[PDB]
Structures are given as C-alpha cells and as structure tokens.
Subunit: 95 residues, 3 copies
C-alpha cells in the first residue's frame, strides 16, 4: 500500500481542470505553505495530467500533516483526493 | 484561497436536505462541541441556505481542529464538505 | 452516535474487487501506525462486502485513524469511516 506510506511528496487528484497551471501552483502554495517548507509544486497541463499536482515538502512530517489536514477539502467545489507519491522526488536525494 | 484561511466560523455544505432544522442544529452541536466553545449555529432550510450550516466557535484554533477532524465525515449518509467562512 | 468515540472504526466504500485476505493485510498495513490493532473483521458475504471493522486497543487510536484516513482514496474509492454502532 505504498500510497499510504509517508514521504516528502503528496499527490493531489480531483483538482478543478479549468484552473490554469500558473494559478493552480500559486493557489496550492497558499493552501500548503502552513504545513512546512515547500521545495516545489509540480503540475503538468498535458491532457492526461490535468486535475493532478505534486507538492514536495522539505520534511515528511509536513507532508503527513498537509495530507491529513487537507484530505477531502472542497476546493473550487471539488473535494481534494490526497495520497503520498509512490516514489519520492529526486530533489530529496540532492538535499 | 480565503475558504482555506482559518476563521472563527466553519461553513459546512453537502448536508442531507431531508433533516429538519431543529434536529440538524442539535446534531451539529453534538458533533462540533468537542472542538471548542460554540457561540452559535446558523441553519435555514430556506432558499439558497439549504444543505448548509455555519458553526461559529469562540476561538479560530477550535474551528481548525473541527474542520480538519470532521472533513468528509459521513453525516446522515453524506460526507461533510467543510471550509472556513469568508470574512 | 456514529460520531461518539469507541474502540472500533467501521469502514465502507471499500472496493469490492479486493479479496478477504488481501483486504485484511492492506487494512493492517494502513491502520497499524495509529495504535495496537486487536483484530479486523471482514466478511465476503454479499451484505458485508465493501465493509470492515478495525478494533484498536485504545479509543484515542481509533479517533486518530478515523480523522487521519477519512476520505483517503484507496483503490480509486474515498474511504468512509465512522465509529462502530449497534
């Protein structure tokens, strides 16, 4: 059940697909910044990748609090669906 | 993203529209009183207020614990959708 | 009542594709971080499908598991969690 095992990265699904990547990244930064230091936020607007984002935290504890605190939060009328990434970002190996 | 910025008041939607007002308020009180001092609960089944409820806590910290703990709780067979109220 | 803390969480909206043995091993792997699990009840009878009970040694463990895993998207389905009721 790797998606339930804490690591530095949360995977968010069920995001409103009408939000532009630029606006999405700024909004996710304002939502998630209260849980710890964000290294970066990933959004692909490649057709298959819409409604999805990755928030990478400096510490695992920050990602866990963010995941438990924001699970199901109705953002632009849609509940956020949050997991941990199955694999954690290469940036963590470089920390 | 002001719906995600902590406030004294939580805004709940996706409430079961078949529950009547006196029973919905009493149930909302019984669920939310463990998180802090509740100043008041606004429910109306009138117009664009239906399926919704405002719980006003004495302290913001109580609202934050209430919203995070009860987000998606299946209340009368519907998952609670909880935001902070707008200022 | 479903909101009043007790030793046991009742989970539904579980994907019915999952078989008894894998579902119990998966639920133990998911919920073991919240406290000591005493057992997990699963039945693959029709009326018991998509459902499970996780019994913790302490009520505080059950409360943490329910608040922490509420709505968790497991096999494409957000977990629905309540405390066990009569």
């Amino acid at each position: 059940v790797p998606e339930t095992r804490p690591n530095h990265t949360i995977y968010i699904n069920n995001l409103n697909e009408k939000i532009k990547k630029d606006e999405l990244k700024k909004s996710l930064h304002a939502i998630f910044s209260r849980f710890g230091q964000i290294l970066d936020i990933l959004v692909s607007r490649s057709l298959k990748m819409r409604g999805q984002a990755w928030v990478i935290f400096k510490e695992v504890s920050s990602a866990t609090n963010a995941l438990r605190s924001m699970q199901g939060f109705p953002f632009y009328d849609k509940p956020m669906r949050i997991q941990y990434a199955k694999t954690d970002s290469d940036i963590i190996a470089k920390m």
